[PDB]
Amino acid sequence: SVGKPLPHDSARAHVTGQARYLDDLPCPANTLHLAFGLSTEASAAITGLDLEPVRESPGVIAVFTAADLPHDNDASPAPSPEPVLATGEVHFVGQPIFLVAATSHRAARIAARKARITYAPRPAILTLDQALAADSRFEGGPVIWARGDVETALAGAAHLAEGCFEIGGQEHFYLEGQAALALPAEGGVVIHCSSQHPSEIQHKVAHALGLAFHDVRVEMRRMGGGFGGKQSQGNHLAIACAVAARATGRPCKMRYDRDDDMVITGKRHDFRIRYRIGADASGKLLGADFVHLARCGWSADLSLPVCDRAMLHADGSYFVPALRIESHRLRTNTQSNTAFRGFGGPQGALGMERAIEHLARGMGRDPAELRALNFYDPPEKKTQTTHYGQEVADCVLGELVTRLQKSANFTTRRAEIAAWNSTNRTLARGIALSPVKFGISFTLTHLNQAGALVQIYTDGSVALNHGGTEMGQGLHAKMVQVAAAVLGIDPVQVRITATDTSKVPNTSATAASSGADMNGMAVKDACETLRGRLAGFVAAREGCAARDVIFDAGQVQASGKSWRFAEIVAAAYMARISLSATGFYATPKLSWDRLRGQGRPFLYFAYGAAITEVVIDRLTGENRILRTDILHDAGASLNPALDIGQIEGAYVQGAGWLTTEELVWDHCGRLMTHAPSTYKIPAFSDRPRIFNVALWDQPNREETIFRSKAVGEPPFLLGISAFLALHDACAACGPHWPDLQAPATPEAVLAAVRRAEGRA
Amino acid sequence: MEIAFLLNGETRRVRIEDPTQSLLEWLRAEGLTGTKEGCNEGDCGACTVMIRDAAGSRAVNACLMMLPQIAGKALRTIEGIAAPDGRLHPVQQAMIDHHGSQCGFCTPGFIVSMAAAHDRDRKDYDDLLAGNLCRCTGYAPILRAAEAAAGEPPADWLQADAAFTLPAFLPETSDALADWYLAHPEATLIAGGTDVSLWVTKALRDLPEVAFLSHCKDLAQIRETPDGYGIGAGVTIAALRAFAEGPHPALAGLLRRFASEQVRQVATIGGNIANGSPIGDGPPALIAMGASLTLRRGQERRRMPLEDFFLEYRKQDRRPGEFVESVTLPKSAPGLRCYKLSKRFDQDISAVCGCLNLTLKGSKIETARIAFGGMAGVPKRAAAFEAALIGQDFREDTIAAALPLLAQDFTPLSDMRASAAYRMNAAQAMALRYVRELSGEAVAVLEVMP
Numbered sequence A: 001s002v003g004k005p006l007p008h009d010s011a012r013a014h015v016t017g018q019a020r021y022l023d024d025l026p027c028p029a030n031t032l033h034l035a036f037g038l039s040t041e042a043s044a045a046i047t048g049l050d051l052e053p054v055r056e057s058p059g060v061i062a063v064f065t066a067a068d069l070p071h072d073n074d075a076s077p078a079p080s081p082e083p084v085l086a087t088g089e090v091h092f093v094g095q096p097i098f099l100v101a102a103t104s105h106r107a108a109r110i111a112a113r114k115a116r117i118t119y120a121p122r123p124a125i126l127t128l129d130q131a132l133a134a135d136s137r138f139e140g141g142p143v144i145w146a147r148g149d150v151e152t153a154l155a156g157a158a159h160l161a162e163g164c165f166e167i168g169g170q171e172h173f174y175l176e177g178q179a180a181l182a183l184p185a186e187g188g189v190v191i192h193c194s195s196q197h198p199s200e201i202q203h204k205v206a207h208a209l210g211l212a213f214h215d216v217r218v219e220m221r222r223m224g225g226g227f228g229g230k231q232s233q234g235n236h237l238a239i240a241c242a243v244a245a246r247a248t249g250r251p252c253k254m255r256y257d258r259d260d261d262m263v264i265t266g267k268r269h270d271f272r273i274r275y276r277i278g279a280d281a282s283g284k285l286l287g288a289d290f291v292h293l294a295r296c297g298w299s300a301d302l303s304l305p306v307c308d309r310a311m312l313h314a315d316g317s318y319f320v321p322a323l324r325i326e327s328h329r330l331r332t333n334t335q336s337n338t339a340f341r342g343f344g345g346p347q348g349a350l351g352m353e354r355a356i357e358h359l360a361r362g363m364g365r366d367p368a369e370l371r372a373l374n375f376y377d378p379p380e381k382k383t384q385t386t387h388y389g390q391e392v393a394d395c396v397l398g399e400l401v402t403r404l405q406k407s408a409n410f411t412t413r414r415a416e417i418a419a420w421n422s423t424n425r426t427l428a429r430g431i432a433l434s435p436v437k438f439g440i441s442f443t444l445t446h447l448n449q450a451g452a453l454v455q456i457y458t459d460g461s462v463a464l465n466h467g468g469t470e471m472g473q474g475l476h477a478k479m480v481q482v483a484a485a486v487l488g489i490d491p492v493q494v495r496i497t498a499t500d501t502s503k504v505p506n507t508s509a510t511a512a513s514s515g516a517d518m519n520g521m522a523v524k525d526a527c528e529t530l531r532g533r534l535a536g537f538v539a540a541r542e543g544c545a546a547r548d549v550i551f552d553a554g555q556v557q558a559s560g561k562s563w564r565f566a567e568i569v570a571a572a573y574m575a576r577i578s579l580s581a582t583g584f585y586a587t588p589k590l591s592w593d594r595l596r597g598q599g600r601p602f603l604y605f606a607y608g609a610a611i612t613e614v615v616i617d618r619l620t621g622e623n624r625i626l627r628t629d630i631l632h633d634a635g636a637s638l639n640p641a642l643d644i645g646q647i648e649g650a651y652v653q654g655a656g657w658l659t660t661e662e663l664v665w666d667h668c669g670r671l672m673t674h675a676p677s678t679y680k681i682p683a684f685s686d687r688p689r690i691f692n693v694a695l696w697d698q699p700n701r702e703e704t705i706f707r708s709k710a711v712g713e714p715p716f717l718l719g720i721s722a723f724l725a726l727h728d729a730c731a732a733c734g735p736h737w738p739d740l741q742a743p744a745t746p747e748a749v750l751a752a753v754r755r756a757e758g759r760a
Numbered sequence B: 001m002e003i004a005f006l007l008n009g010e011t012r013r014v015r016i017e018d019p020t021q022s023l024l025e026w027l028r029a030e031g032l033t034g035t036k037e038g039c040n041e042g043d044c045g046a047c048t049v050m051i052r053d054a055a056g057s058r059a060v061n062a063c064l065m066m067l068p069q070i071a072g073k074a075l076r077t078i079e080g081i082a083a084p085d086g087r088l089h090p091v092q093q094a095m096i097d098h099h100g101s102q103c104g105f106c107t108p109g110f111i112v113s114m115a116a117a118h119d120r121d122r123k124d125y126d127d128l129l130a131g132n133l134c135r136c137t138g139y140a141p142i143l144r145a146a147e148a149a150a151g152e153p154p155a156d157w158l159q160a161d162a163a164f165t166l167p168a169f170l171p172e173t174s175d176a177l178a179d180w181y182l183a184h185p186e187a188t189l190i191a192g193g194t195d196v197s198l199w200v201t202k203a204l205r206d207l208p209e210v211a212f213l214s215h216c217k218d219l220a221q222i223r224e225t226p227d228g229y230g231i232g233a234g235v236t237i238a239a240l241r242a243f244a245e246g247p248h249p250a251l252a253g254l255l256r257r258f259a260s261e262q263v264r265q266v267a268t269i270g271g272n273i274a275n276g277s278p279i280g281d282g283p284p285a286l287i288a289m290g291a292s293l294t295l296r297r298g299q300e301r302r303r304m305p306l307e308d309f310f311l312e313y314r315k316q317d318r319r320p321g322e323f324v325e326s327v328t329l330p331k332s333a334p335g336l337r338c339y340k341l342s343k344r345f346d347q348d349i350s351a352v353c354g355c356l357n358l359t360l361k362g363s364k365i366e367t368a369r370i371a372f373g374g375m376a377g378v379p380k381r382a383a384a385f386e387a388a389l390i391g392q393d394f395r396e397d398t399i400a401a402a403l404p405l406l407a408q409d410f411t412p413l414s415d416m417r418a419s420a421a422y423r424m425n426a427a428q429a430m431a432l433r434y435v436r437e438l439s440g441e442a443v444a445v446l447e448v449m450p
């Protein structure tokens, strides 16, 4: 089955509406619904809390203070504490101080507002400049990694370019909002939730209730999107549900409304990047000097590992002899930023892509040629390393870019625009190529383990269960395709179970694009074990070596005789051979020192390239993509179709982050963009009018599941292409350096045209 | 109170005891879990349902739709798109084949939205599916799907709904409305409900005394009069855009980008006007083409120019018992142009809305009608800039020479959608655009071919 363009595990159930998400799920007539009461102050001591009108509001069955919580008031993924209900003080506008439990969802949302809270407000850290000046930061100082001596390279670099640019945040906008249901199954609880990470939900609920882990069970069939948001910010609702369930004796469900969701929960860390990049007269980089200022928010969340990935990807796609990052983990009284597709990679990589571009324009060289000249060497006695010193011997970017530019007709179109530009005076076209080098695996390396559990029933039909969770990436499809591949049976015969902590325990988050890689291996292990059992039994029963029992096309063959897979299982049942097996996998070769900034964090890297064409109106700044040409490397793809899709959407979302999506706070830490009306993700007509996504088909150098390559996060970084092309459009206006900022909204685009033109 | 309708083939009657309960509510409460929740603000079409009546089949957001509106209609939800025998709509299959699914959440919305397009044989998927948004796939798979599903014959079972039927006031005649609204001044009027329902779902507000104008055919009228065209306050934007196509290709072009197709089917012109928004996109167009409004205080009829209707912010020339009845726009307005500007093109609140319409007499500017949305807290015409342009040459430099007068006409605001500087700057930019476009320049960014 592996390598077929088969459809998503629920594509029909999807398209007919019968796919059921948390809020869709049936439940008892007494199920109460919960709502958070949110702080309106950015940095205050709560000196008055009268929840009298809240309790008296109708439908209200229970209303909760931090003081009411029986155990651990913590949801943080970090060993650093983050309360669920505010403890004595508030740290950002939107912090849940209390929790209503009402007979209807509507009713609780109504009662949530009826609170009488008197705050004693303190000064508030809102901008990075403040945070940095007030020493409002995490980890106790910045992290500083250096390869060689940058200072010395830049001293005598033939060409050097310095700059400083803003990179805004990003809201997730998963169509299914954060959601959880608690069910008090006597003794312990059962949690159903729209979560990327069931096992931490287990951990967090367990602690909040005060019962050992074996009493909390988390089931998870699907999500309406995850993108990093559901990788932690589930804990809050799942704690809220289990704590209220425990207390009210009833089953308690909780789901945010879009308005709550954006206000309460954290987004993509906005960055500021200062770059000092230098080269020689030939074009080969002498070294780059980076400073990251990261907007982590009022709480740790996943800020630590996020900024580690940012620094790891600070090499973009290029070999640099001397590289230094100084990464600041700043705290502000805003939302606790979390994980998001790319997990910081996009941010560090964009700073390298802005530096390399600014250098190109400066020395008056074509960026594509300067990037081509500065890639990592293709494989096949000293292999180049990264700034963290990991050997890069799997880099196909030489070939890939050459492959893409030829197919995308890159040179003709860029010259074709030159003429189009000189004919126009109101509209300008732009075009840029962007490379992707993205390391695959968990930064924190012990999370690199995945588990499975496969049943084979007497009618032949198997039941699949792993630790990975479905958010739409088509994970189960790949698992089914692997499972059917290994047993030599039709993928029909493989059925997928909902993700369970009681089926596969001690899961990691379904994150870092690892999901398909490691679980694939996990599935394959259990399947091979079972397939071995059946083979051994046959070769005994049929007289011969198990090696010679071939399992294929739902048929078993041995001794020159053949049975259906069904017939062989029933017999091995009758023989009393176990048809249930677990499967486990832990990623090999991984070892690095975070604080040192040395070692091999990644098993391998995923590559790709994107050429984007755009138009800009010089008068207002209005913009749109016209064409996109992608050639992403998926290794030997587990599902060609599914992968191509991922790459399409990852790019659209990538570009969406650098274009129309913009997060805005007022002078009080109030998120002004807290609805779909004011946060503008890419809408239908925004799709690249000509959208060519092609795969790079070449087996992975490393021993991954069927030579595949984790395709989740990497193709997000293709969106850079559009931001660069938009800058290439601005460059066409005047002789000056535009200094385009992320996001490149019509206003921010005009402001770059304006600079190139030499105005204000 | 009782209303009946056709829910997915079955004939259903319902007892209205709460008139303001949305249709999204009703369905999910009833069990129709296939319709989903995305925000209850209309922006993401996760709940696009299909309705049908004497007019034809239309795609709407169930979260903006109050039950007493679907009275007498034919409703089709996602769980009822496929054939009763079990066969999938050509849309459902094409979407399976062309992988229009990843997380599956927005899928019900699109299916319903595409199905209604498929039924009415519509193909402008760009504008048509602009309502329901998806985070996951990048729309390209959906666009392939919709084109493949296009070739297949219409769903004959969905077609069968056409034959159907052929406490909270619901009028049937415009008189009967003025009649009732004469005695109930403090009554919450619901036309399309695309702004009133955001007070109930988001702002959580209770409103006794309600009247659905969405059942007064004589209030929703296109009628030709000697002077021009008499558009009734009940006319829906989709239809207003559809009617403009001929006489006003410029107004249609703006109305293209008015909300989504979902909201355009139910949102009305007189609703948008009587709403009284400064970031309202209806007025500036109508005000730049000098269209007279019409009010009714029972048997009373006032008829002022639309600019006069808006005095202060949130304060309008409405009298207790008075309501918007119709608007009157003259036959032709060849010099009119409308410029909407926002972060994203489709379905967004415009930061600046530039409406310009002059006459020539060779080269000299005759009558200038320059009007703006979002520039000051009320849709008003730019006087100082306008007075400067009249009786002057229609060249770039002269128009550039009076641009600073707009900074005396308005002093814009600075929210999350634009900094005053840029809002002001783009306002000026729209005037240069107008002189360029009219001289035959390539100015439109949306019109550029890849």
Ligand SMILES: Cc1cc2nc3c(=O)[nH]c(=O)nc-3n(C[C@H](O)[C@H](O)[C@H](O)COP(=O)(O)OP(=O)(O)OC[C@H]3O[C@@H](n4cnc5c(N)ncnc54)[C@H](O)[C@@H]3O)c2cc1C
Pocket (backbone or CB within 6 Å): B041, B042, B043, B188, B189, B190, B191, B192, B193, B194, B195, B196, B197, B198, B213, B233, B234, B257, B258, B259, B260, B263, B266, B267, B268, B269, B270, B271, B272, B273, B274, B275, B277, B279, B280, B281, B282, B322, B323, B324, B325, B347, B348, B349
């Ligand atoms: C998703 C979404 C997108 C939107 N996009 C846009 C947009 O692009 N451009 C824009 O300008 N607005 C937009 N709006 C807001 C806009 O105000 C309404 O959607 C619409 O224009 C109003 O028409 P309606 O028929 O829905 O009126 P309703 O919402 O029914 O009425 C709104 C107000 O007008 C009053 N009213 C309505 N009709 C009459 C009448 N005949 N006589 C007296 N009073 C009346 C009502 O009592 C109420 O106070 C959008 C709203 C949403 C939810």
Ligand code: XAX
Pocket (backbone or CB within 6 Å): A196, A225, A226, A227, A228, A229, A231, A339, A340, A341, A342, A343, A471, A472, A473, A474, A475, A510, A511, A512, A513, A514, A515, A516, A517, A646, A710, A711, A712, A713, B102, B103, B136
């Ligand atoms: N349709 C769809 N595709 C998606 C996502 C989604 O929500 N919906 N999310 C991601 C993310 S975000 Mo991350 O480290 O948590 S920050 S990991 C990750 C991811 C997970 O899928 P594996 O590669 O593990 O199988 O692919 C992407 N593709």
Ligand code: HPA
Pocket (backbone or CB within 6 Å): A302, A305, A309, A339, A343, A441, A442, A443, A444, A509, A511, A512, A513
């Ligand atoms: O790469 C990652 N992605 C998500 N979470 C993580 N935690 C450590 N590394 C990662």
Ligand code: FES
Pocket (backbone or CB within 6 Å): B036, B037, B038, B039, B040, B041, B042, B043, B044, B045, B046, B047, B048, B061, B062, B063, B064
């Ligand atoms: S609720 Fe999301 S648009 Fe109807």
Ligand code: FES
Pocket (backbone or CB within 6 Å): A175, A224, A225, A472, B100, B101, B102, B103, B104, B105, B106, B107, B133, B134, B135, B136, B137
């Ligand atoms: S498929 Fe995930 S939101 Fe549309």
Ligand SMILES: [Ba+2]
Pocket (backbone or CB within 6 Å): A171, A172, A173, A229, A261, A262, A265, A266, A267
């Ligand atoms: Ba979020």
